[PDB]
Subunit: 727 residues, 4 copies
């Protein structure tokens, strides 16, 4: 008589299975066959549990884990209860400091491989051979919110990849936009305080829609470019799988001859680009604040590995000055029209972690963890970052020995004369702890730099100037990049940007700030400032109306790479559809629905007014995954409503609103047979409407129209029609 | 030419004003006249800012706070930039561990006074004289969610009062229900792990609606009473002002002769009892997750002092 | 061309070799063959160094480890120097908090085994089978001084043994005396502050000879018993090998039927008992403050394993009250005359650690780490200790996860639901982190208590009383134990005790304290108080002279087990002798000296006025280990001066004083041939003198007389004669 | 940060400056100072940018580094003049 169910339904299948199918589970039990050298190196610190006795941390078996030791069944607890003291103590000290920023984050394991050797341009060992597989750990994140904030907030996303290479750890620590907010790291804390909750009262959580953030923006137009991206649909992604990733700074590649090439790094999503819309995103933070962390986890269990393609923008040394902005200014993007992104290799994220604290929470990414073959530039934001990511570990992860924490451990050799941290794991046997040393024949030894397996050596850049605290004049341009961004966007994308600003700005309490931000917008584009100013109830003045727009960027009038939806590359594999059930589903409808979806890798969740089962018209038993309220349209890409006893749900508030919300958020909707009577609620015509798939029954045609709407991600053409619906 | 608006609309009135009326503000600038012995004792560690020079933590005035010191307007940052190192360092180490539980919480200052001497039943100095005013600090909280989780979750609320008495600090550390989940503290961590996010993936945040929590419940019926309260509208209050508070345990009062009387403590809301409904509460976590922290803050600025008996 | 010497004389032999013979070395390189399950379990965290590249902690090879990265061979250091930042950072954070007490300490690995199964009296698995070998780690220590204080101070010694058993870690955390200073742990900090340096100025280091300590003593006569031991030669041991060890508290043994037997634990030194004398000890703290740590290290490299025999005093439950002091009072000893010590097993300390910080500094001993088969009693000092040793780790070793630090890791299984410390090493795969849990079928499971491999369960002692803060009346006796101690001591031992008090008391500045301590001594023994009071220039009053001595202890007038030297058990194996060389040593003298010594395991160090070599009369080349000043008589057990060119050293200040100091500290001295002319300096007669071995040459007879003096440890009979010598 | 437990070590009594010290640095471990500034960043309009930068000057000025000319490449090399 043990407490597990007799039929074994406590324990999930060790098999790729869809979202909702099984309980979720630590990667090593859900996917024991997936391996790589990092994950196998972790074996020495994994701990199982089955068929083991419960014990104190010192090895003692425990007989009663239900009670304190007391003088009598009703007496005081005694101080000699060391079992209770240890158990409580450990609990008492469970928590460690959250990250200063990107505290909220979700990770996975995986690997990378280059498409071709890159030894022409860099000696980076991990890029030397397309047969060389490099294990990676990746953590995606928000920026502002605490470790327990929501996933779908309007924020920048972080995208950090730790490469466990054969010649050291390389950390690629990037974001989901190609620029940053600020130019010099010295104002880092200023900006971060400005967007972080306000100090007197700790409000708002994971939001920029407050007074101080915009106050800052309005006084530092350097921020405006990235603020643009934030306000766009870019700042509210569908999935960590459906965003682009950027290294932001220009770095250097260095080859075996010592030739430097400037580079900026990119991650390009094989899943394509896709993002939510605001109302959907905002309300989803309430309905499932773990939406991204969840979707990532499930996508992986489900076999839908997130894949990204590592690409380089490369710029030769003698081109440093050909662009009319500065390559070292991190608030400027390099348009792909001027420098295209060359795909170099690919990363696959193919297994979840076992313990979220152990592996995610404690991981330490730092951009200055580079390897031979790479080097820095004078980007004055990058310069700063170098300092901070080592420092902060000392209090986050408790000391200098954070590289000994399992997930952070290199997978190549590491030896030196560094001794003695807090929580030191390694026990050095070297008779010497210094060099030069004769007593251990100077081991371990320096290694001269070389083609492969060499010492690190910095590129010998010429430095000429005086010791000054002064912004480069070449950084003094703020508007042409925002403008470029804005004119690259589709019309509906621009409505969103407008509504983005209007919403945020409307929660700035001190109205003079609203005006000052509008004033900034005037310098970027007058359409934009008009639309926003209308929505805030502001009249642009004559002065403002006449403001000259900034120059084209190097003669560019737009760059299609900056739009999410310019050239849809939306991909349905991994997406999810809601199927609204009634007690009497027409089975051959449903057969055809699930069969079609399954063929293109699209997941379904069957929903009803309650849990349990319903039966088909042919007596197939249909298990319910959640109720209408339990799994709102927010959480799905489309809604399908098959035929049957429509009378069952026809007057159900929740089923109707499921459709109304779905419609307002521009999602595809498919109604078979009598389900078409739901058109009434969505105030649709009897003639039909684009984006509403309809028919006597679900067939070849019905499903294909639907899936094709899905390849378009959203039904943009619906926008004009949604303001009348009240959802 | 400074950056404040000419008409002075950056700076809030030092006056009781309604929610939305003014920008919110630190108590000592919004309500400088409100005092008590705790708040005045804090004077030695308060720091103002107006008409002061921006400096390093060591006292040095800063001339340019917009730049790292580099070799040339376009060169590398130098290690001799101690102004930048201190500024970043302090930022680097800003965060301290969140609470194991009740990490998400909202506070205020205030005071207490007894209606009548209680020396018949207890020698507690703070209850000895209805003229004795005791400064308090109170923190209300959720239980499960992190310090950056939502306010209007379906959880237990904490209700902690620090009394700064004349014969020592008395902490009254209670909840918004009159019982607890478990019987012996030895299973504390077990239950808390059961309701806290699941260890493999850190899901769900400030929710009990997951497998492990109910698994535990189902195997330990001792929990059922408090689980009842949680499931009721009690677990989704309107306002920290509109819930009851409980010490839960039976304690003792001890008087000057040494007579013990058993006691259980209560806070009764002069605002009365009021709670949201689920759909409203759940969606409100999305629309304004700082709803309680906000409402408390504003109610206070607004002169609507939360009072409890 | 590497920096090691061509002949390989940088690298020590992997062979048992005497003190001075070889450079010392990490256990795993000096004694690679010595093993045990703990030491082999450490393999996964050891790090070698030969034939490895020097790297950053992240794996990157370093090419130049001699320079910061600067703008120009003469420019500023750049913030992008991550190699320098990591290297300095790690150094910057090297140090962790020292122990509150016993901060100064020296350790080694080893093992224990029982002489016979003990299952009659306890189910302690480690005592179940004499074939069961249990790895141990032992740390000896002082109490008061910081981690960088001297070894040979007049203090209590700690003696802590961690047993890595098959059913959990058992920590035996004892001292070198059988009682403590205080009765209730609540006054722990008071006493420790009293003896620790004074708070205004941090003086004195590792000494009790100051105002506050004696002030405390004088006001809390509970301390007097242990203070007695401290003042005796017990408080200044020769070697960690030559002291007794005590668990102090009465504990319980619990067998398979649940029968409790009270027990007190002992370690009995197979090396026997031996201690220095004050002047020698005090001056040795200056000449070699690492004397004990060194002697231990070398003794081990040298094959002279320290061995101790674990013995129990056992007292049946129904005897609790037969003694006229309380078994639970930790300031009372159980005389071996009333309860003898039964030898139970043996421990061998047979290998040094590899890294002192890794293994010694970070180890965590805690007396409440017990196992099934053992349990506590209500000793109110013990009760306290239980609380403190878990707590203090949280800040010393940085968190709750200190059991994961390699040396502290159990060697049996350990599994539970404890999650997430700072610096968490273990990665839990259990789908559950709580119990009862159905989702992992409640694993790991509680284990009901049983004969072997059972859960821990406390002995179900009856508790009856009210919640009070009151010392037991049965503890209210302070003097009879001191008295017992004192009357067990030999006359010369008592001079030492007297001089102990007189010395300490003389550095108490406020004389009223001196008087009050004298007053306490009056209640113990009047001889003693007279002698001390004379030396402080105090006249005992009539009142004081008449004070009635305390009762015998259970009719005892002495107990020989309390004397160091009552029954000499002094053992020469491992001891060291100084041989004073001249440029023309008579080789057949020396041959015979070293040959004799070697036969009984006694080490020699050859000394001279300078380093290098001298040559024998037969042209054998004699390497010098240190100069006369370099290795003072303090550091050796005896002095031998062979024949030869005595003229060479005869007028040498240092060689003469070597002998004078040696003589004043009662050491054996042996002079052959013309070396007898040195008798002049030691103001010895021409007739001879006991303790000075002399002859025409070193032969069978000469050596044996010397070694026999050594088996007596010191020449006590010399005491009356030493006050005339001025050394 | 590890010896004295955090970034706020300047608040430890002996280390406390005796002149004024004000900035936008917030929140260490063991934070003693309670900042009342409505703002924790600059530029800020909501507290009229206080506390303010101070231009360098004869006395009571901002700190400014001596504008030494730097000319050389990024090398890890001991100056020959030190040999
Ligand atoms: C170039 C723009 C930047 C990008 C793309 C960026 C990226 C990130 C990301 C993605 C994280 C989360 C890392 C994780 O998952 O562990 C992060 C954390 C951090 N960042 Fe930023 N960051 C940027 C600017 C800065 C600046 C200017 C500073 C300080 C000057 C800074 C200091 C930190 C620190 C101290 C942490 C986390 C604490 C730690 O992981 O040790 N970063 N950075
Ligand atoms: C009787 C039921 C309980 C009530 C009414 C209760 C109340 C609370 C409240 C309201 C907080 C938040 C305090 C704040 O605002 O700072 C809290 C925190 C805490 N509680 Fe619970 N609690 C209960 C049970 C427990 C148990 C069984 C344990 C451990 C055995 C525990 C240990 C903690 C710790 C360690 C903290 C916060 C860390 C700290 O403030 O130092 N409490 N308690
Ligand atoms: C019964 C008399 C005592 C004996 C035989 C004794 C033995 C020792 C020894 C030998 C050490 C050094 C441990 C090592 O090498 O790591 C020690 C450390 C310590 N002792 Fe004492 N002790 C005694 C009394 C106390 C009392 C009364 C307390 C507190 C109430 C105390 C608390 C500590 C702490 C907190 C440490 C070291 C910090 C740590 O190792 O975690 N001990 N004890």
């Amino acid at each position: 008589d043990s407490l597990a169910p007799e039929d074994g339904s406590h324990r999930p299948a060790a098999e790729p299975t869809p979202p909702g199918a099984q309980p979720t589970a630590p990667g090593s039990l859900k996917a024991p066959d997936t391996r790589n050298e990092k994950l196998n190196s972790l074996e020495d610190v994994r701990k199982g549990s089955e068929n083991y006795a419960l014990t104190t941390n010192q090895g003692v078996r425990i007989a009663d884990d239900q009670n304190s030791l007391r003088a009598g069944s009703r007496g005081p607890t005694l101080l000699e209860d060391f079992i209770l003291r240890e158990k409580i103590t450990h609990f008492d000290h469970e928590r460690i400091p959250e990250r200063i920023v990107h505290a909220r984050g979700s990770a996975a394991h995986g690997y990378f491989q280059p498409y071709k050797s890159l030894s022409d341009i860099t000696k980076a060992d991990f890029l030397s051979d397309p047969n060389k597989i490099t294990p990676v750990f990746v953590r995606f994140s928000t920026v502002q919110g605490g470790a327990g904030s929501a996933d779908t907030v309007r924020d920048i996303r972080g995208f950090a990849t730790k490469f466990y290479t054969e010649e050291g750890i390389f950390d690629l620590v990037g974001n989901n936009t190609p620029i940053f907010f600020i130019q010099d790291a010295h104002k880092f804390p200023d900006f971060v305080h400005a967007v972080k909750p306000e100090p007197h009262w700790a409000i708002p959580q994971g939001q920029s829609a407050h007074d101080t953030f915009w106050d800052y923006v309005s006084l530092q137009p350097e921020t405006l470019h990235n603020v643009m991206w934030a306000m766009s649909d870019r700042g509210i992604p569908r999935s960590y799988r459906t965003m682009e990733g950027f290294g932001i700074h220009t770095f250097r590649l260095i080859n075996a001859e010592g030739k430097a090439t400037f580079v900026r790094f990119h991650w390009k999503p094989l899943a394509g680009k896709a993002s939510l819309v605001w109302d959907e995103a905002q309300k989803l933070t309430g309905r499932d604040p773990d939406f991204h962390r969840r979707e990532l986890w499930e996508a992986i269990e489900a076999g839908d590995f997130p894949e990204y393609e590592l690409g380089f923008q490369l710029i030769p040394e003698e081109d440093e000055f050909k662009f009319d902005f500065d390559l070292l200014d991190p608030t400027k993007l390099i348009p792909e029209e001027l420098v295209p992104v060359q795909r170099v290799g690919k990363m696959v994220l193919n297994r979840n972690p076992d313990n979220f604290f152990a592996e995610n929470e404690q991981a330490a990414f730092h951009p200055g963890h580079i390897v031979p073959g790479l080097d820095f530039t004078n980007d004055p934001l990058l310069q700063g970052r170098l300092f901070s990511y080592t420092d902060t570990q000392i209090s986050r992860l408790g000391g200098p020995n954070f590289h000994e924490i399992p997930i952070n451990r290199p997978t190549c050799p590491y030896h030196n004369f560094q001794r003695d941290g807090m929580h030191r794991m390694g026990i050095d046997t070297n008779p010497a702890n210094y060099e030069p040393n004769s007593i251990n024949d100077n081991w371990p030894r320096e290694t001269p730099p070389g083609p492969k397996r060499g010492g690190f050596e910095s590129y010998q850049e010429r430095v000429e100037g005086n010791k000054v605290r002064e912004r480069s004049p070449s950084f003094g341009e703020y508007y042409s990049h925002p403008r470029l961004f804005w004119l690259s966007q589709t019309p509906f994308e621009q409505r969103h940007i407008v509504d983005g600003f209007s919403f945020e700005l409307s929660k700035v309490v001190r109205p003079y700030i609203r005006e000052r931000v509008v004033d900034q917008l005037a310098h970027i584009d007058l359409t934009l400032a008009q639309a926003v100013a209308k929505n805030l109830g502001i009249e642009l003045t004559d002065d403002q109306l006449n403001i000259t727009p900034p120059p084209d960027v190097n003669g560019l009038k737009k760059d299609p790479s900056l739009s999410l939806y310019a050239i849809p590359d939306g991909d349905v594999k991994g997406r999810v559809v809601a199927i609204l059930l009634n007690d009497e589903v027409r089975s051959a409808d449903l057969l055809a629905i699930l069969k079609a979806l399954k063929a293109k890798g699209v997941h379904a969740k069957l929903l009803y007014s309650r849990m349990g089962e319903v039966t088909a018209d042919d007596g197939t038993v249909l298990p319910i995954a959640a109720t209408f309220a339990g799994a709102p349209s927010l959480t799905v890409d489309a809604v399908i409503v098959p035929c049957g006893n429509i009378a069952d749900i026809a007057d159900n508030g929740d089923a109707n609103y499921y459709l109304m919300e779905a419609y307002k958020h521009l999602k595809p909707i498919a109604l078979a047979g009598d389900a078409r009577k739901f058109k009434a609620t969505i105030k649709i015509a009897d003639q039909g409407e684009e984006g509403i798939v309809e028919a006597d029954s679900a067939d070849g045609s019905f499903m294909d129209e639907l899936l094709t709407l899905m390849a378009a991600h959203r039904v943009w053409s619906r926008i004009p029609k949604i303001d009348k619906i009240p959802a």
